[PDB]
DNA sequence: CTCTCGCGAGAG
DNA sequence: CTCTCGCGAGAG
């Protein structure tokens, strides 16, 4: 699993969160992003509810590497939160 | 309100979050940080308990300014989240 | 305390 | 859709 330049060409380059919003939209359906989390962990505030399965960690790490290449001043922890932010803003 | 170099000098320079954690512990008591949020916004979740009041926004901008001088490639909004993380760290 | 991290309101 | 930003479990 390898993100290509033609996928990267379609994505806002002004800001990392904007790049992530565009790239996730190129790679994934809305239904997929609404039903998965970054890590598959239970939310501290979800009691006795379905736990969303994790993204493919190979796809996560490719997403992070491509983002890091275009945004050298963003770091691992920030890009992870940004992928989570996009996933959190998708509804079934 | 101005942050002095003697306060900056007591702080980890390796990572912005470590710097912010050190800097805020030099400026504020644990109990102050325990009981404030960055902006004083009402929780999206716990709507019953009293709302933690905001930090002083002048102090916030002086912290972001001093952070930005040492970590010029960290953006303003990340620094705001890091100030938030450290307040949360005191709860 | 510290970090990571899924979630939510409510206003753009 | 998109952002800011507070809660809070669990492992460290």
Residue numbers in the entry:
A (entry chain B): 174 to 265
B (entry chain A): 174 to 264
Text lifted from the article:
To further investigate the role of cytosine methylation in BEN domain binding, we successfully obtained the structures of the BEND6 BEN domain in complexes with the CGCG motif and CGmCG motif containing DNAs, respectively. Our binding results also revealed that the BEN domain of BEND6 exhibited comparable binding affinities to the methylated and unmethylated CGCG motif DNA sequences with Kd of ∼39 μM and ∼33 μM, respectively. In the BEND6-CGmCG structure, two BEND6 BEN domain molecules bound to a DNA duplex in an asymmetric unit. For instance, both BEND6 molecules used N262, N261, and S217 to make hydrogen-bonding interactions with the bases of C3, G5’, and G8 of the DNA, respectively, although N262 of the BEND6 molecule 1 formed a water-mediated interaction with the base of C3, while N262 of the BEND6 molecule 2 formed a direct interaction with the base of C3. Similar to the BEND6-CGCG DNA structure, R254 interacted with the base of G7’ in one molecule and interacted with the DNA backbone in the other molecule.
pmcThe BEN (BANP, E5R, and NAC1) domain is a ∼100-residue protein domain found in metazoans and viruses, but missing in nematodes and urochordates. There are nine BEN domain–containing transcription factors in the human genome, i.e., BANP, BEND2-7, and NAC1/2. The BEN domain-containing transcription factors regulate transcription by recruiting chromatin-modifying factors to specific chromatin regions via their DNA-binding BEN domains. Further structural analysis revealed that although all these BEN domains bind their target DNAs mainly through the insertion of the C-terminal α5 helix into the major groove of DNA, the residues of the α5 helices involved in the base interactions vary from one to another, explaining why they exhibit distinct DNA sequence preference.
